[PDB]
Design a protein around this nucleic acid. Structure first.
Ligand code: ZN
Ligand code: ZN
Lengths: 114, 115
DNA sequence: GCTCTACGTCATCA
DNA sequence: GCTCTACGTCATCA
Protein backbone atom coordinates (compact mmCIF):
# COMPACT_ATOMS: atom_id res chain seq x y z
CA UNK A 1 0.00 0.00 0.00
CA UNK A 2 1.13 3.62 -0.66
CA UNK A 3 2.64 5.28 2.48
CA UNK A 4 2.97 8.78 3.80
CA UNK A 5 6.18 10.36 2.36
CA UNK A 6 7.13 11.78 5.86
CA UNK A 7 6.48 8.95 8.31
CA UNK A 8 6.47 5.97 5.87
CA UNK A 9 3.85 4.30 8.11
CA UNK A 10 0.38 5.81 7.66
CA UNK A 11 -1.64 4.86 4.59
CA UNK A 12 -4.50 7.28 5.02
CA UNK A 13 -3.53 10.67 3.72
CA UNK A 14 -4.74 14.05 4.77
CA UNK A 15 -7.70 14.77 2.49
CA UNK A 16 -6.82 18.39 1.91
CA UNK A 17 -3.09 17.96 1.30
CA UNK A 18 -3.69 14.86 -0.82
CA UNK A 19 -6.67 15.97 -2.93
CA UNK A 20 -5.99 19.67 -3.17
CA UNK A 21 -2.21 19.92 -3.01
CA UNK A 22 -1.32 16.36 -4.40
CA UNK A 23 0.94 15.63 -1.40
CA UNK A 24 1.04 12.04 -0.12
CA UNK A 25 1.11 13.30 3.53
CA UNK A 26 -0.80 12.10 6.53
CA UNK A 27 -2.66 14.47 8.83
CA UNK A 28 -0.44 13.72 11.91
CA UNK A 29 2.67 14.50 9.78
CA UNK A 30 1.18 17.69 8.43
CA UNK A 31 0.75 18.88 12.08
CA UNK A 32 4.29 17.82 13.05
CA UNK A 33 5.91 19.58 10.10
CA UNK A 34 4.16 22.93 9.77
CA UNK A 35 7.43 24.24 8.26
CA UNK A 36 6.37 22.20 5.18
CA UNK A 37 2.64 21.68 5.39
CA UNK A 38 1.08 24.73 7.06
CA UNK A 39 -1.62 26.44 4.97
CA UNK A 40 -1.05 30.13 4.47
CA UNK A 41 -3.57 32.72 3.44
CA UNK A 42 -3.05 34.86 0.50
CA UNK A 43 -2.34 37.86 2.70
CA UNK A 44 0.34 35.84 4.63
CA UNK A 45 2.05 34.85 1.35
CA UNK A 46 2.34 38.50 0.44
CA UNK A 47 3.70 39.57 3.89
CA UNK A 48 6.08 36.71 4.58
CA UNK A 49 7.32 35.80 1.09
CA UNK A 50 6.70 39.03 -0.94
CA UNK A 51 4.73 37.14 -3.60
CA UNK A 52 2.52 39.29 -5.79
CA UNK A 53 -1.07 38.98 -6.96
CA UNK A 54 0.12 37.99 -10.43
CA UNK A 55 2.17 35.08 -8.93
CA UNK A 56 -0.55 33.93 -6.49
CA UNK A 57 -3.43 34.22 -8.92
CA UNK A 58 -1.58 32.03 -11.46
CA UNK A 59 -3.53 28.74 -11.35
CA UNK A 60 -0.65 27.11 -13.23
CA UNK A 61 1.84 28.04 -10.48
CA UNK A 62 0.27 27.05 -7.06
CA UNK A 63 -2.38 24.71 -5.82
CA UNK A 64 -4.89 26.56 -3.68
CA UNK A 65 -7.80 25.79 -1.39
CA UNK A 66 -10.59 28.35 -1.32
CA UNK A 67 -12.94 28.82 1.58
CA UNK A 68 -15.60 31.35 2.53
CA UNK A 69 -14.04 34.53 4.02
CA UNK A 70 -14.22 33.99 7.78
CA UNK A 71 -15.16 37.67 8.39
CA UNK A 72 -18.17 37.44 6.04
CA UNK A 73 -19.35 35.18 3.23
CA UNK A 74 -20.15 38.32 1.21
CA UNK A 75 -16.44 39.20 1.18
CA UNK A 76 -13.95 37.79 -1.22
CA UNK A 77 -13.07 34.12 -0.65
CA UNK A 78 -10.09 33.11 1.47
CA UNK A 79 -7.37 31.33 -0.49
CA UNK A 80 -4.94 28.95 1.27
CA UNK A 81 -1.53 27.93 -0.09
CA UNK A 82 0.76 25.18 1.17
CA UNK A 83 3.99 26.44 2.70
CA UNK A 84 6.30 24.11 0.87
CA UNK A 85 5.09 25.35 -2.61
CA UNK A 86 5.04 29.08 -1.74
CA UNK A 87 8.34 28.84 0.02
CA UNK A 88 10.06 27.00 -2.88
CA UNK A 89 8.84 29.64 -5.37
CA UNK A 90 9.94 32.46 -3.09
CA UNK A 91 13.40 30.93 -2.71
CA UNK A 92 13.80 30.69 -6.55
CA UNK A 93 12.48 34.26 -6.66
CA UNK A 94 14.65 36.02 -4.07
CA UNK A 95 17.72 33.58 -3.99
CA UNK A 96 17.13 31.25 -1.00
CA UNK A 97 16.29 32.10 2.64
CA UNK A 98 19.34 34.42 2.53
CA UNK A 99 17.86 36.42 -0.40
CA UNK A 100 14.40 36.51 1.18
CA UNK A 101 15.79 37.93 4.43
CA UNK A 102 17.78 40.53 2.44
CA UNK A 103 14.59 41.58 0.69
CA UNK A 104 12.90 41.78 4.12
CA UNK A 105 15.77 44.04 5.29
CA UNK A 106 15.40 46.31 2.13
CA UNK A 107 11.66 46.87 2.68
CA UNK A 108 11.93 47.57 6.42
CA UNK A 109 14.54 50.18 5.65
CA UNK A 110 12.10 51.59 3.01
CA UNK A 111 9.40 51.85 5.71
CA UNK A 112 11.76 53.40 8.37
CA UNK A 113 12.29 56.37 6.01
CA UNK A 114 8.60 57.15 5.44
CA UNK B 1 -36.31 65.29 -41.68
CA UNK B 2 -34.25 65.02 -38.49
CA UNK B 3 -31.41 67.63 -38.51
CA UNK B 4 -27.93 68.08 -37.20
CA UNK B 5 -28.02 69.59 -33.66
CA UNK B 6 -25.08 72.02 -34.36
CA UNK B 7 -25.98 73.36 -37.80
CA UNK B 8 -29.68 72.60 -38.01
CA UNK B 9 -29.23 72.01 -41.77
CA UNK B 10 -27.64 68.67 -42.66
CA UNK B 11 -29.74 65.56 -42.65
CA UNK B 12 -26.89 63.03 -42.94
CA UNK B 13 -25.11 62.44 -39.66
CA UNK B 14 -21.47 61.44 -39.11
CA UNK B 15 -21.70 57.66 -39.04
CA UNK B 16 -19.24 57.22 -36.13
CA UNK B 17 -20.63 60.05 -33.97
CA UNK B 18 -24.19 58.95 -34.69
CA UNK B 19 -23.81 55.13 -34.57
CA UNK B 20 -21.23 54.78 -31.78
CA UNK B 21 -21.63 57.94 -29.70
CA UNK B 22 -25.41 58.60 -30.32
CA UNK B 23 -24.81 62.23 -31.37
CA UNK B 24 -27.05 63.55 -34.17
CA UNK B 25 -24.11 65.61 -35.61
CA UNK B 26 -22.95 65.91 -39.17
CA UNK B 27 -19.32 65.30 -40.20
CA UNK B 28 -18.67 68.93 -41.21
CA UNK B 29 -19.91 70.16 -37.82
CA UNK B 30 -17.73 67.70 -35.99
CA UNK B 31 -14.66 69.03 -37.88
CA UNK B 32 -15.71 72.59 -37.04
CA UNK B 33 -16.26 71.91 -33.27
CA UNK B 34 -13.38 69.71 -32.09
CA UNK B 35 -13.86 71.21 -28.61
CA UNK B 36 -17.02 69.03 -28.53
CA UNK B 37 -16.59 66.18 -31.04
CA UNK B 38 -12.87 65.33 -31.18
CA UNK B 39 -12.07 61.65 -30.59
CA UNK B 40 -9.56 61.10 -27.85
CA UNK B 41 -7.49 58.04 -27.22
CA UNK B 42 -7.58 56.28 -23.88
CA UNK B 43 -4.16 57.60 -23.12
CA UNK B 44 -5.12 61.28 -23.94
CA UNK B 45 -8.09 60.93 -21.60
CA UNK B 46 -5.80 60.04 -18.73
CA UNK B 47 -3.28 62.79 -19.58
CA UNK B 48 -5.67 65.61 -20.29
CA UNK B 49 -8.53 64.84 -17.90
CA UNK B 50 -7.00 62.56 -15.18
CA UNK B 51 -9.63 59.89 -15.65
CA UNK B 52 -8.70 56.45 -14.40
CA UNK B 53 -8.76 53.01 -15.99
CA UNK B 54 -11.76 52.10 -13.79
CA UNK B 55 -13.76 55.10 -15.21
CA UNK B 56 -12.76 54.61 -18.85
CA UNK B 57 -13.18 50.83 -18.71
CA UNK B 58 -16.78 51.35 -17.42
CA UNK B 59 -19.01 50.38 -20.41
CA UNK B 60 -22.00 52.06 -18.64
CA UNK B 61 -20.27 55.39 -18.54
CA UNK B 62 -18.64 56.26 -21.86
CA UNK B 63 -19.47 55.22 -25.36
CA UNK B 64 -16.23 54.10 -27.02
CA UNK B 65 -14.90 53.27 -30.44
CA UNK B 66 -12.21 50.61 -30.70
CA UNK B 67 -9.83 50.21 -33.52
CA UNK B 68 -6.71 48.13 -34.15
CA UNK B 69 -3.68 49.57 -32.38
CA UNK B 70 -1.90 51.60 -35.04
CA UNK B 71 1.57 50.50 -33.84
CA UNK B 72 0.69 46.76 -34.30
CA UNK B 73 -2.46 44.70 -34.51
CA UNK B 74 -0.94 42.35 -31.95
CA UNK B 75 -1.00 45.16 -29.31
CA UNK B 76 -3.98 46.15 -27.25
CA UNK B 77 -6.85 47.79 -29.24
CA UNK B 78 -6.98 51.59 -29.46
CA UNK B 79 -9.96 53.10 -27.67
CA UNK B 80 -11.47 56.46 -28.79
CA UNK B 81 -13.81 58.55 -26.60
CA UNK B 82 -15.74 61.64 -27.59
CA UNK B 83 -14.54 64.86 -25.93
CA UNK B 84 -17.94 66.19 -24.82
CA UNK B 85 -18.67 63.04 -22.79
CA UNK B 86 -15.13 62.74 -21.33
CA UNK B 87 -14.97 66.44 -20.57
CA UNK B 88 -18.46 66.54 -18.99
CA UNK B 89 -17.55 63.58 -16.64
CA UNK B 90 -14.14 65.19 -15.83
CA UNK B 91 -15.82 68.53 -14.90
CA UNK B 92 -18.20 66.67 -12.52
CA UNK B 93 -15.11 64.91 -11.05
CA UNK B 94 -12.70 67.81 -10.55
CA UNK B 95 -15.18 70.78 -10.22
CA UNK B 96 -15.44 72.37 -13.67
CA UNK B 97 -12.66 73.60 -15.96
CA UNK B 98 -11.30 75.59 -12.94
CA UNK B 99 -10.88 72.47 -10.69
CA UNK B 100 -9.30 70.53 -13.59
CA UNK B 101 -6.58 73.20 -14.02
CA UNK B 102 -6.01 73.06 -10.22
CA UNK B 103 -5.60 69.30 -10.29
CA UNK B 104 -3.18 69.91 -13.16
CA UNK B 105 -1.25 72.52 -11.05
CA UNK B 106 -0.97 69.93 -8.20
CA UNK B 107 0.51 67.16 -10.34
CA UNK B 108 3.03 69.38 -12.13
CA UNK B 109 4.20 70.54 -8.70
CA UNK B 110 4.44 66.86 -7.58
CA UNK B 111 6.73 66.14 -10.58
CA UNK B 112 8.81 69.30 -9.81
CA UNK B 113 9.05 68.08 -6.18
CA UNK B 114 10.65 64.84 -7.50
CA UNK B 115 12.93 66.83 -9.88
C1' DG C 1 -4.08 36.70 12.21
C1' DC C 2 -9.42 38.06 5.07
C1' DT C 3 -9.37 40.21 0.19
C1' DC C 4 -9.50 43.57 -3.50
C1' DT C 5 -8.37 47.73 -5.21
C1' DA C 6 -8.27 52.64 -5.26
C1' DC C 7 -4.90 56.36 -4.77
C1' DG C 8 -1.49 57.87 -7.90
C1' DT C 9 3.71 57.55 -11.55
C1' DC C 10 5.98 55.49 -14.91
C1' DA C 11 8.62 52.17 -17.70
C1' DT C 12 8.37 48.63 -20.42
C1' DC C 13 6.59 45.38 -23.36
C1' DA C 14 3.02 44.28 -26.02
C1' DG D 1 -0.27 62.50 -30.51
C1' DC D 2 -1.23 53.40 -28.28
C1' DT D 3 -2.19 50.34 -24.06
C1' DC D 4 -1.66 47.35 -19.98
C1' DT D 5 0.61 46.41 -16.10
C1' DA D 6 4.41 45.56 -13.00
C1' DC D 7 6.88 47.97 -9.61
C1' DG D 8 5.79 48.93 -4.97
C1' DT D 9 2.60 51.01 -0.28
C1' DC D 10 -1.48 50.88 2.15
C1' DA D 11 -6.23 52.11 3.46
C1' DT D 12 -10.59 50.97 2.96
C1' DC D 13 -14.42 48.52 1.96
C1' DA D 14 -16.06 44.42 0.79
ZN1 ZN E 1 2.90 10.56 7.90
ZN1 ZN F 1 -24.13 70.02 -38.80
Amino acid sequence: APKCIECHINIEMDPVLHDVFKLQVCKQCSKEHPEKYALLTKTECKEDYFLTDPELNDEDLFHRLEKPNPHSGTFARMQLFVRCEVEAFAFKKWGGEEGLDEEWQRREEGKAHR
